[PDB]
Amino acid sequence: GITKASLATESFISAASFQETTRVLTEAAVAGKRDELRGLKENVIVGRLIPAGTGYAYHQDRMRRRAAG
Amino acid sequence: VPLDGGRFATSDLNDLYRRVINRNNRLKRLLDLAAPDIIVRNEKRMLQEAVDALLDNGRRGRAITGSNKRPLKSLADMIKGKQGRFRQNLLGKRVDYSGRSVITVGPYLRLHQCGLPKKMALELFKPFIYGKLELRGLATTIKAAKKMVEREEAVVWDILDEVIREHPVLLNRAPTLHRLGIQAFEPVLIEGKAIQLHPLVCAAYNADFDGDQMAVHVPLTLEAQLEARALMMSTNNILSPANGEPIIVPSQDVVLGLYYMTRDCVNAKGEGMVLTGPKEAERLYRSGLASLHARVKVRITEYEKDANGELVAKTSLKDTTVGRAILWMIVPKGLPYSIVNQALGKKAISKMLNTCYRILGLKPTVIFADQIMYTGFAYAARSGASVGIDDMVIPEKKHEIISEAEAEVAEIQEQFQSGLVTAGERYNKVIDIWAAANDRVSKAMMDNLQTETVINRDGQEEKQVSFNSIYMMADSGARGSAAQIRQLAGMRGLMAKPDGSIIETPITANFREGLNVLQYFISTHGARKGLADTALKTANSGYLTRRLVDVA
Amino acid sequence: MVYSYTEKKRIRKDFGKRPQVLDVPYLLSIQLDSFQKFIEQDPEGQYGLEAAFRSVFPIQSYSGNSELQYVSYRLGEPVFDVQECQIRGVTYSAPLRVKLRLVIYEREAPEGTVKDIKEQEVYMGEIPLMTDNGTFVINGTERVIVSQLHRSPGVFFDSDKGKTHSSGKVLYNARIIPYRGSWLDFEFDPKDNLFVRIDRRRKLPATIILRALNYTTEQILDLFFEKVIFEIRDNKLQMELVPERLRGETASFDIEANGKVYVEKGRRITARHIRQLEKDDVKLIEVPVEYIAGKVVAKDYIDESTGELICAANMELSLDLLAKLSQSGHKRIETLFTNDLDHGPYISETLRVDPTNDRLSALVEIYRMMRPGEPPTREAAESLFENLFFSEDRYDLSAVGRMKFNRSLLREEIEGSGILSKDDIIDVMKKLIDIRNGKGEVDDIDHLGNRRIRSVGEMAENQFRVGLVRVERAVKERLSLGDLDTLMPQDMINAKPISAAVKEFFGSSQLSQFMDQNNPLSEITHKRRILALGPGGLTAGFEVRDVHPTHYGRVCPIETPEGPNIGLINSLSVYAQTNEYGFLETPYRKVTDGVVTDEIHYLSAIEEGNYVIAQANSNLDEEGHFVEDLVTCRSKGESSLFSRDQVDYMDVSTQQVVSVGASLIPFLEHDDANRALMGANMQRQAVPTLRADKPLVGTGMERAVAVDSGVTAVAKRGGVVQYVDASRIVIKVNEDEMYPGEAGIDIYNLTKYTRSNQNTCINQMPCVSLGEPVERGDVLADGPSTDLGELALGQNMRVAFMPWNGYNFEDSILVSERVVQEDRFTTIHIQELACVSRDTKLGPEEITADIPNVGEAALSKLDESGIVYIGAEVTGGDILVGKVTPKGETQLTPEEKLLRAIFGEKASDVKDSSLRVPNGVSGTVIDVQVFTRDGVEKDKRALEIEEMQLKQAKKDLSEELQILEAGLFSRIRAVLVAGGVEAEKLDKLPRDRWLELGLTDEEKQNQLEQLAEQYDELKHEFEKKLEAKRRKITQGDDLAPGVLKIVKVYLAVKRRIQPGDKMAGRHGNKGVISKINPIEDMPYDENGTPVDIVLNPLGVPSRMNIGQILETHLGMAAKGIGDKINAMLKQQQEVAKLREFIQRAYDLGADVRQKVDLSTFSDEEVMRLAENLRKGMPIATPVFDGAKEAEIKELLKLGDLPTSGQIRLYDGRTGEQFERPVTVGYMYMLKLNHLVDDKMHARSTGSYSLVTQQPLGGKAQFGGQRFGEMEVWALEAYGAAYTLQEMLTVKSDDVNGRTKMYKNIVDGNHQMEPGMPESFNVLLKEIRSLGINIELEDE
């Protein structure tokens, strides 16, 4: 269901927005989860260009610099 | 931090942190005093409780703040909330360079602009005004510039027109639903405290004039100005993203005008004459010679682009009216004259815009759409359409239909008293015969109301679609509908008691007549449930969109 | 009674037929009546301070035989009067002085007292007082306490079918709800096990409470079950058979006695078999030894020999067990009568789920339920359980509780004990089982017989009671250790504790609220209001919001808010009243035999239930026989045709279904209920206007709304006006209405321009002229938004329905300049701005007029003291109060320091705190008040004011006495002239010497005496009133800690009307004036008269409110009858010509209730009436009794105007005609106060919040607009990333980017160097403050 599928989100900062904050933070901190941003919700939280639209050019340009010599 | 009157106020963490410190400190002490086991254990347990209350309160005892009943808010409660995070959640951070106010019409606006109060714009663009004031040297220094606009010196208004000229502003309405809830406009300086909003957009926003208020935002950074102009701009989104159909569709007054414009009665001034072109058709109308709607042949030149990207021309004598000839003046190029030759209701008038978009493109549809509005309002104004009490016509046979259907109900009643039919079978029967009556009365006043203009041309008779005011509203699509008209003249419905049953004694009267105490009192339940349902289903819908944008 | 004196001025022509038998009662009844019972001396336990005292008193110590009891209580005169209490800001209150008696009983009595000291009226608390209009003044601000509606205490049985378990089967639960004390819940479960729970607490097996009542298993079984007697006679098992036991059962064996087999095996026993057994009287039958295998034995049974229990009570017998109790010598064995349909075997199986055994066990198991985890104790469990429902202290149902309880249990006594009895709980359980058995029904909460109405009096009674329990602990506590004669009932009973319960209610409570005073309808409709949730109750559920059949005549169907709480408010109906017991009852007409009798009868929600009630609209004549042989009536919850002589009662009025709000909408019967709600809902928002107008179209309530609400000034007694000033009105009382002593005249002091709660203007005007006769109950002076005693909430105007170049587009309104020029929709606002001089650790702030860095032009408008002059016109930014606060060692910078060297300025040690006029608002200063801490020296201006207030007080007080003395001596003159008349002789000598002359033996000598006594009292009462006033003036007003002094400036802004203002008619038609058009461009008729407003016709069909069109038409017609008179009055035809035509208007063709003139004096009286009619002819459309098309068109005939209600109109631009007629007429229109220059806000860079740096308004230059989640999605759906970043970074949350940005906006470089929002930067520290390590990786 729509509500069930949104539960799983790679970005833990995205999940901490709309899910129960306490549980997400613990479950990620144990696993040591590394949020790469890359999503919309999280980039807004952290205050950068949305990785879509005008910003879609930016993230692309950086993503390739990443994991790259 | 301190407050006025010298009282101090502080966060709850302090009451919490202090406890954890104290118990901890006492425990350190109780080791050097070598206290008995029963105590150091208890101090340790106590330290455990305070750390818990500091971190996440409510997972053990729910400690209460000092001298205050309310449990003190902890670090877990600072991050947390309803729902998830306080930071980005609705709602969602206040933002500078903004404003809001009550909105009014502004039919003069082109589709790409909006009336912005003079005063709002002064305070809104304040840094822009300061820098431009000392960029041209009208102000010695930024401070003196502050004093000039703070003084509202006459020279500043002209500088404001400069900082405004090409500089879009964002307009937003209250329940932002689709992306069209925010749209960019070019600001036009307006005396007065009201924001003026182009009527054609009023539909996408779901914005009335009954006092809805809207917010303005200034696109500061250069990337935001070109984004506002090239993405969120009004002229750049003319079509709803849900379905490709235009959301810029002419609204109520405008469509009543074009409906009254392209329409024809049976006999009218200038009937039968022929004119060279739309130009002298308008010359006939404005000058008082010819009636706006009369059947007339006029020479028109239409265009069809059926070549390969190329406009063909073809001219002919089209059999049409005076009003349609005049309206053709707005229609650009490659549209056939066929599109304006019909009666031009609100439905056809949207498909006119749609085809204009799919043939000539964006720019022609925009300047066209504007034109339709201007002309719609204007001709509607000449028309003198109104609504009087003698404009709502009740059928002459109504008293007879109610009486005939009322005999049916007393017959089924005779069958229930005699046991010929069961209580339920009776109830259902009575509900149906009353139901049939509603359809009977409704399709009665509709025939009488609809065609009843019955007129004479050079001969005995003929009958056309009625020109009665309230009817024109419903045929055009401006406002009102066969259901609502039916409530005015023919009987209105069978209301329903709160538990969901439907009263077997309909409301036999309507609004042109009076509703009595009972009829009105019974109507109350439907109204009261109506308002709640929209207000809860409004909220229910929003929850759905939330879940939806989250999953995508 | 045939028309009054202010009725002679203007008469409203009234359509409608139905005679009004009953008249709108006092609209303020509920609010005023309630508080009257609370504070009152009741020589009995009736609710009041007397009753609440008798509850908690007397308080006796613990065994110490030291008792402190209560004698009587009293309310001292208020500390400040209402007006003074408001200016200073304290609460309008009276001191509560209660006589208390301390008795000490001799230790080891016979009980007798060593000493009892009676403490004279110890003061406990100040209880607030209610205004003559039913508002309270809490701190200088008028407040209303809304009545609340709750579930009446008693017992109530509900269903809970469906949702539970989704097996169907329903459920049946009982609930005992006391007025105070714990809740007792009884409920079944899917297994037919009876359960009980205290509060919402753990569920417990029902029988466990009965054990706590000392009922052994045998008597519980003995209580709820019948006894089946089993006999062992001869051998093997006989049994008694009640011929009725066999109904609903199939024969299980051969049932035979008397040599005749009545029923065979397998044939169910129906009424025939039962008839045979009943009529043949078969008492004893022979039964098999196998029939008792299921039957439950009633009492205990033991074996006599071994003295051992064979079987315990409530155990199932078996064929083998019968042998073991048969051989023990048992002739009789008692069993349960159990039938799964009629009398259910529920309790028996309920005992099997019961973990407890005896009373102590149950009490233990109950106490451990309420307070678990801790070991229960015998003295503790016994004490707790006795303290729950059985103690007079912690539990009361009061009378209504006991009454509804006993009434619902089908008892006799309507009043009884305030606690529960074993009989009560057992009886309640009995009723619950009877419903599950099919006999009885469950009630429903939405019915108004279970819905009770509270109001201020009751709430305060409860609050004062709380003060008494928390002082009680203290009284016992002190009487604990007390020395004998040292302490007295003062050192014990405190003030703050008792005083603070009541103060917290009126001070902060959801039910004490600012009166909605923008408006007389606003006042009166607030004071009548209901709530269904608030504090004491459920603070999903749509069932209770919906309209109920009992709402008729009690609750308004159409006046409720449209929004989050719909049907959660309502309003009180027109004729509605609080029941004796507190329900809602409505007026009715008693129909005896076939006549409609004029005896009124008030029926409660349940009282009305069984009666058949006729309809308010029905046709009767002559003797009052129902004309039709059958009339529409409603009997029990539904309405259908009823026979001629059946009806028990009939509706009093056509109105009684609606509320005061809905009753003011003309042609309401013609408006759809949605828009009607909206209509009666918006009418309370009409801000009053500059010129009070009057509605041209009306209902006839407007008089009642004006008068009953206190906004107006009503004649106390009739007489002739001696003096009329815009200030006061003095009436010479008629002798028939006058009391013998003191004579008198009534001096009415009018309210002048002053602030309302909503910052509108509330100002009274004299409506009578010098030397005019006025009768008791006549309007003396109008209030705000009242005309000649009627209620005008706005101004009617000429309206045309037609699209005007789209300027009316949605609801937008196109208003002629003529409206704004005429200054008619103008509104006067009064704002209270304040300046506080506080105390900071750096030093005190000064109000001095010396303010750093302001020109002489700045300080001009201020006096020497630093406060603006009275009458000085001010605008935005202007300085009202100069204020400067110490801030030392500014610590400036190199370039600022060089600046000071060049321009040689000495930078002050003081910061500028002065109160300056809010931006953009401009008005005239009409007043200044200066409050100073007691002990700080009053400044110059403040001192001048004190002298000013002092002198002004003296003129007023003396003025009273001056007019009073003449009024008294003018009476002495008349009594001396009868029996000793000397006309010229008496008035020569000084008037003061009259008092010596006596008179011949008569009562007139005793009359002269009376006037003497009252004279001297007045001479001295004046003295005492003046002294007190002076002291109240010189005494330093008490201020807050830290505040040295406060200056309140009062600005009177006059705002007119502009695009953006909200306007609406009474019909639910909103609008926003869009353009203000020249008179030149306004659509006009052939006569050349422009039209004031051009409304869009398109708003009418969709929203079905047609009354607005009738309201237009008749309005036009009303204006017609006026214009006609304006011509005959401008012709000065004569009293004769006018009289004829006016009589013509008041008849209007047939069968109306109006009656009328030619009794009115043809000259002085007739001409004045016509003069008041010349504006338009005021008309009355009763609510459901209102006018008709025919009546309206006919009035248009008298008008000289077409029936169509439409005319020819010409566009003022082209001068050319308009095709088609447009409807023009006069629609009454209100200006709501949403006015655009309140709502409009804009911000560039404002102040910012400390905790998170985010825009926040501190100057009242509002913080920026809130950008939300949905608004964020909108930017994400567009491709606009940078607009979103700048929105949530530089424009808000970024402590750097905002400044880095701002410098660039002026620099001419549009960029942003966003950085990280402080919001997330805080989230980082917060997560990291926990044990969570959160880092930002890589690069």
Ligand SMILES: CC(=O)O[C@H]1[C@H](C)[C@H](O)[C@H](C)[C@@H](O)[C@@H]([C@H](C)OC(=O)C(C)(C)CC(=O)O)CC/C=C(/C)C(=O)Nc2cc(O)c3c4c(c(C)c(O)c3c2O)O[C@](C)(O/C=C/[C@H](O[C@H]2C[C@@H]3OCO[C@@H]3[C@@H](C)O2)[C@H]1C)C4=O
């Ligand atoms: C500051 C204040 O006094 O306002 C008071 C008071 C309602 C008004 O101000 C003013 C007299 C107002 O009645 C008129 C005025 C024009 O208002 C409006 O028309 C608008 C359109 C603005 C209504 C709106 O806002 O939508 C209009 C009245 C007409 C209608 C159909 C109407 O009344 N609808 C209405 C709307 C409500 O929401 C509530 C409400 C409530 C109670 C017990 C009510 O009966 C309410 C109610 O009837 O409980 C809540 C949770 O919160 C309660 C908060 C405040 O109470 C204070 C009282 C004391 O003050 C200090 O401690 C105390 C504590 C309780 O707070 C409010 C109760 C609450 O929501």
Ligand SMILES: [Mg+2]
């Ligand atoms: Mg609206």
